[PDB]
Design a protein around this ligand. Structure first.
Ligand SMILES: [Ca+2]
Length: 263
């Protein structure tokens, strides 16, 4: 029931640290609302969507195939690998890995996909190459979550991320089938229930990706809208506090409720 910017400011008051927020119109790309739009925040697992965008760019370039099967070993497994840990014998396809990275936040999957393109610096280069000179990936999972206060590694800004997400989902940087694949994976997110999904009315569409660190940080990127169709991009980041996970989740959910009620 509070106005969305009011609610975002309130969340920051409650949590400490910073909260960043942007809402973009999907069709036009115009900024509808924002708070701290140009300040940096750790991406956490929200980067996984961008990683898959790079993968799909390679598929569209004829340099990768979503059906290519990747065998990996137990030595490749890192923390929070709920899907990849189950496929040591069979491996997983590149498309399966992106599904695991996005829908389940699987870390080994993300590292595997990062190897396909040559590592974090090469994801940065992909972003630079599509006009995003702000967003940067520097580390692998799980270190990219360490969220050291002002250390600009592995960070984006609300506007950079929102703008880049829109460019990946709409327009022609990716083919229609690749744009569609990316949003499908996001729609199938399984691990963001406490966040914007908790506020979502029946019949709405959401495609999202969340991020978390143990302490300090949370975030979500989303394309959502009524009537089965996304019409806006929302990006919310939080960092720099000592808030509990339950309180970070609750604040995101409340920001979501405000955004939906004032749509
Ligand atoms: Ca403040």
């Amino acid at each position: 029931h509070p106005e969305t910017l009011v609610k975002v400011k309130d969340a920051e008051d409650q949590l400490g640290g910073r909260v960043g927020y942007i809402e973009l119109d999907l069709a036009s790309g115009k900024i509808l609302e924002s708070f701290r739009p140009e300040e940096r925040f750790p991406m956490m697992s929200t980067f996984k969507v961008l990683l898959c965008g790079a993968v799909l760019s390679r598929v569209d370039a004829g340099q990768e195939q979503l059906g290519r099967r990747i065998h990996y070993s137990q030595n490749d497994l890192v923390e929070y690998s709920p899907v990849t840990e189950k496929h040591l014998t069979d491996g997983m396809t590149v498309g399966e890995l992106c599904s695991a990275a996005i829908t389940m936040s699987d870390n080994t999957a993300a590292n595997l996909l990062l190897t396909t393109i040559g590592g974090p610096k090469e994801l940065t280069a992909f972003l630079h190459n599509m006009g995003d000179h702000v967003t940067r990936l520097d580390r692998w999972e799980p270190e990219l979550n360490e969220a050291i206060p002002n250390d600009e590694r592995d960070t984006t800004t609300p506007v950079a991320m929102a703008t880049t997400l829109r460019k990946l989902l709409t327009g022609e940087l990716l083919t229609a089938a690749s744009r569609q694949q990316l949003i499908d994976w996001m729609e199938a997110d399984k691990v963001a229930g406490p966040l914007l999904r908790s506020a979502l009315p029946a019949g709405w569409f959401i495609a999202d990706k969340s991020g978390a660190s143990e302490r300090g940080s949370r975030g979500i990127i989303a394309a959502l809208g009524p009537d089965g169709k996304p019409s806006r991009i929302v990006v919310i980041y939080m960092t720099g506090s000592q808030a509990t996970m339950d309180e970070r989740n609750r604040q995101i959910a409340e920001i979501g409720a405000s955004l939906i009620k004032h749509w």
